[PDB]
């Protein structure tokens, strides 16, 4: 997250950390067996990490547990990166508390103008590399259909949205993919794609969550 804040300990509490001998990638956790992420962030032999503040040291509100598996989207495009979200079973659940908790699915896609609160252990520079330890966090606003294709002409589907600031200097970054966007307390986004991190007029693009609801929730009743 470039220009944002640390969030504090264990304030965000569905989200988790993909560990595969090293962080590479964020989640939400949204029920205590499952995990959303990014497509993108696909591979084989993840344990999620929940109750994380500084990734590098054992803090004591952690569990630690394998992925059992992974069910990436039908439809996912990694070249477009249409459909950019998957699903992560564990193989025990987790022990929900105040510090690990799900976050709601949504009932409706939020608007336009809506505030939301981005959060990951990604870069935080727009040109050097530094990686936090700990979480960081950033209050952004979703911004119209309208502007976000102009942003990026032929690149945005009915399945994504931007979020973030023309003008630069607050965004997400690698390292942020698959992290959460989450909106008057309902996962809206999944962190997808951009151009570069916190540049002018290249806003981050999310997954829109509202569109996977359904496959979301037949998913996890048949798995
Ligand atoms: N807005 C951040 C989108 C993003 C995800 N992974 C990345 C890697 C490099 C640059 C941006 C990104
Ligand atoms: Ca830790």
């Given at each position: ?5 640390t ?78 979200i ?63 294709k ?72 048949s798995?």
């Amino acid at each position: 997250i470039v220009g944002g804040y640390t969030c504090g300990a264990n304030t965000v509490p569905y989200q988790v950390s993909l560990n595969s001998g090293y962080h590479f990638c964020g989640g939400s956790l949204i029920n205590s067996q499952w995990v959303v992420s990014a497509a993108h962030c696909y591979k084989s032999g993840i344990q999620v990490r929940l109750g994380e503040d500084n990734i590098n040291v054992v803090e004591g509100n952690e569990q630690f547990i394998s992925a059992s598996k992974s069910i990436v989207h039908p439809s996912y495009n990694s070249n477009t990166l249409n459909n950019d979200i998957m699903l992560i079973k564990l193989k025990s659940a987790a022990s929900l508390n105040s510090r690990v908790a799900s976050i709601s699915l949504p009932t409706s896609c939020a608007s336009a103008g809506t505030q939301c609160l981005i959060s990951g252990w990604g870069n935080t520079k727009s040109s050097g590399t530094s990686y936090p330890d700990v979480l960081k966090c950033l209050k952004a606003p979703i911004l119209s259909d309208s502007s976000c294709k102009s942003a990026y002409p032929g690149q945005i589907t009915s399945n994504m949205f931007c979020a973030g600031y023309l003008e630069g200097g607050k965004d997400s970054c690698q390292g942020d993919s698959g992290g959460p966007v989450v909106c008057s307390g309902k996962l809206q986004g999944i962190v997808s794609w951009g151009s570069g991190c916190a540049q002018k007029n290249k806003p981050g693009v999310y997954t829109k969550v509202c569109n996977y609801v359904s496959w979301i929730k037949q998913t996890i009743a048949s798995n």
